[PDB]
Amino acid sequence: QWAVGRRWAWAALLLAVAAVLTQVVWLWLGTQSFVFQREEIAQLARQYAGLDHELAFSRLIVELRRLHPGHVLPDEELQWVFVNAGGWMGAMCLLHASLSEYVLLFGTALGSRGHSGRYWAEISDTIISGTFHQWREGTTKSEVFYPGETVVHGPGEATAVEWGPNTWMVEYGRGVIPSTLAFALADTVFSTQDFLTLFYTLRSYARGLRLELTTYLFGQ
Amino acid sequence: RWAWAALLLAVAAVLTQVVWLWLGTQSFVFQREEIAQLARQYAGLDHELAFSRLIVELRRLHPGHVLPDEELQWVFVNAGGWMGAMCLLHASLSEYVLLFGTALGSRGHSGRYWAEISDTIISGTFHQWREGTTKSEVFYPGETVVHGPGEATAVEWGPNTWMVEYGRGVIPSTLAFALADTVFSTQDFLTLFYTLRSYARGLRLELTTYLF
Amino acid sequence: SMQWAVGRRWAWAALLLAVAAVLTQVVWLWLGTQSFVFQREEIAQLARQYAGLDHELAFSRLIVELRRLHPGHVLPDEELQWVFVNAGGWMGAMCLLHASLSEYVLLFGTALGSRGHSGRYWAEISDTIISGTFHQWREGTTKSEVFYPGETVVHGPGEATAVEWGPNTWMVEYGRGVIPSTLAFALADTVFSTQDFLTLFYTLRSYARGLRLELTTYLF
Ligand SMILES: CC(C)=CCN1CC[C@]2(C)c3cc(O)ccc3C[C@H]1[C@H]2C
Ligand SMILES: CC(C)=CCN1CC[C@]2(C)c3cc(O)ccc3C[C@H]1[C@H]2C
Ligand SMILES: CC(C)=CCN1CC[C@]2(C)c3cc(O)ccc3C[C@H]1[C@H]2C
Region entry Targeting to endoplasmic reticulum-associated lipid droplets: which residue ranges (chain A)? Predict the structure, then answer.
């Protein structure tokens, strides 16, 4: 037998860790189990667009609790919380939250303009009421969306968003949600100082994570 | 020399007792409905003429508690995403009075400070969207809107909106929300200095009035 | 005799002092021939000729004419990129056509409109409107001015205004002064609001391209 040098063992362990971590991340990605399909949320919320946004939200929540038992928060853990980011302000009520998927009801009663953000997640907004103006990166034109339509904010893409008065939509997102949470709390920390809103957002996220962990370990 | 270390605690307890008693024995210069009616009177006038008449009547009703014309100054306010301007008439650790507004209009956060705010509208519109609600409320010239302590709303001021404002609470707590966007969005340190100087002038006026 | 003869070391030190004085005097003349590539309000007098048309054709023809007029000082079509611009609570987009330490030229605007704070930098900014509206609110007043297609907004050095842009606003912009002071404020929201570091990279790279073009033109 023979020995191996220290700097040689450095590169050897580097290669070993590289192989192990790459194959482990691949085995991780291969076992990803998305609960909601890429277009299920939109194809369901379109069936309620045009109603009273309160009635539409209630019916959508009942339908999502019926179709996916164990992945929608209870009536007690539903709470509207403000959200300030990229210069815009709205309100959200979270229904489903995990490390890859999230579902919520987003909206604003006054309207707002701002920067959508650049993060690693594909997000779908199905308009229940109001208008949605979108300005894509590198254009001089604005695209308007009305109730029924669905806006797909793609990963990497950066758009200027504008919601009109009484705008209300159903949002579903899939990707690296922790990467969204950095942009999520920027205006809360450096503008509004509304730390109770920060706590409410983090508590809703923790409640969604706990519900998903419970349904994973025991479920049904 | 241990007693020398404990004597500071003794004197500090005595000083805190004095401060507590003085905070208990504290009267307020202005009342809510006073400012409300005074502002609703001048609602139908031009906003500049209304401001002038209101400053005149406030100096009449409360001398020594309103700033002089040499220390009156319009200063911008960038906070919670919204932008406006204000002119501070009176300021203390407990109360403040100022004319506020915006000529272009704005939308943004309301703030979560330890103070009750009262905005009486001279011109324009005030849209308020309360926390946990899905509808909005509107206030037209002459009406008064109260922003409670520890409450967060969404505010929207239309074009050419101007109002009178009177707040009562722990005013130093409202200062953290006051300089957030000034440092992290506009970097307008001249306006920051102007705001701090207006607050210092109000404190100086109140001190020299209470002391002579 | 000895009357006209001069020593050598004295002459050496005298020439050193003379060169020192001459250089310290001609360093002042660095402000004597400013030679601004654009004669005061030339950009406004130019852009007022193409403002009536659609904004894209106007932009194209303006870039063509400006490359004709001052060649070598305008970026080529390979380095013309629209970049989002968030600052002072407002959002728009820019396309840089000229960049230097004393002056800059670009095309600015937004499709959705935006309101916010102008900024307190050492610069005289000239925003010449091509399409849309401009609303300016000067400091100390309670009224506002409005500017329509064909006019020019002059943002003075050290001033501070409230800026508003309506829907489909597009203008050209030319500014003199210490541009790094403007750049310090230009990317504050990008750090503390949008957190779009890719846009920060794009804007800094565009400024670097402008500086490189202006450097390799004075040396060639
Ligand atoms: C405007 C678009 C495209 C999506 C809005 N949406 C709203 C909810 C969401 C969870 C969020 C939460 C925050 O606390 C701050 C910002 C944002 C932006 C995203 C989500 C990542
Ligand atoms: C938004 C509402 C309801 C009132 C605004 N008003 C404007 C003036 C004021 C002094 C101020 C100053 C700042 O620099 C930042 C925030 C605020 C909130 C209050 C005052 C405490
Ligand atoms: C608003 C006014 C008066 C001029 C706008 N104009 C737009 C382009 C410009 C380069 C810029 C870039 C930023 O990234 C952020 C802010 C600003 C403000 C100036 C320029 C200095």
Answer: 1-7
Cβ C132 vs Cβ C112: under 8 Å: no
Method: X-ray
Measure the CA–CA gap between B97 and B87, rounded to whole angstroms.
Answer: 9
Distance CA B95, CA B169 (A): 6
Nearest-angstrom CA–CA distance, A121 and A103 = 13
Q: Which residues of C touch B189 (CB under 8 A)?
A: 120
In angstroms, the CA A50 to CA A55 distance is 10
The verdict on residue B31 lying in a domain is yes
Locate A7 and state its tokens.
Answer: 């700097």
CA Rg value for chain B: 19
Total domain count for chain C? Answer: 1
> Can you say whether the dihedral through the CA atoms of A145, C51, C63, C30 is positive or negative?
negative
From the CB of C214, is ligand 3 less than 6 Å away?
no
Whole domain around residue A90: which residue ranges? 32-218
Secondary structure (DSSP) of chain A: -----HHHHHHHHHHHHHHHHHHHHHHHHHT---SS-TTHHHHHHTTTTTS-HHHHHHHHHHHHHHHSTTSS--STT--EEEEEETTEEEEEEEEEE-SSEEEEEEEESS-EEEE----SEEEEEEEEES-EEEEETT-S--EEE-TT-EEEE-TT--EEEEE-TTEEEEEEEEE-HHHHHHHHTHHIIIII--HHHHHHHHHHHHHHHHHHHHHHHT--
Q: Is residue C27 part of a domain?
A: no
Task: Report whether A158 contacts A107 (CB < 8 A).
Answer: no
Interface residue A129 vs chain B (CB under 8 A): no
Backbone angles phi, psi at A108, to 5 degrees: -165, 140
Q: Which amino acid is at C153?
A: V
What's chain A's length in residues? 220
Contact C75, C139 (CB under 8 A): no
Select the residue of A168, A193, A197 nearest B176 (Cβ to Cβ): A193
| Residue C39 belongs to some domain of the structure | yes
**Pair C105, C75: CB distance under 8 Å:** no
Helices B47-61 and B32-41 cross at an angle (nearest 10°) of 140
SS3 content of chain B, % helix, strand, coil (to 5): 40, 30, 30
Q: What is the dihedral of CA C94, C96, C97, C98, to 10 degrees?
A: 140
At what resolution in Å was this solved?
Answer: 3.1
- Closest by Cα among A89, A194, A197 to B176: A194
Residue B101 contacts C, CB cutoff 8 Å? yes
The residues with which C218 forms a beta bridge, in sequence order, are none
CA distances from A156 to A187, B127, C196 (A): 20, 35, 10
Burial of C26 (0-12, 13-18, 19+ CB in 10 A): exposed
| B80 vs B170: CA distance, rounded Å | 19
Task: Give a yes or no: residue A9 inside a domain.
Answer: no
Query: A-chain residues within 8 Å CB-CB of B79?
Result: 191
Distance CA B70, CA B67 (A): 8
Give the largest CA-CA distance in chain B: 70
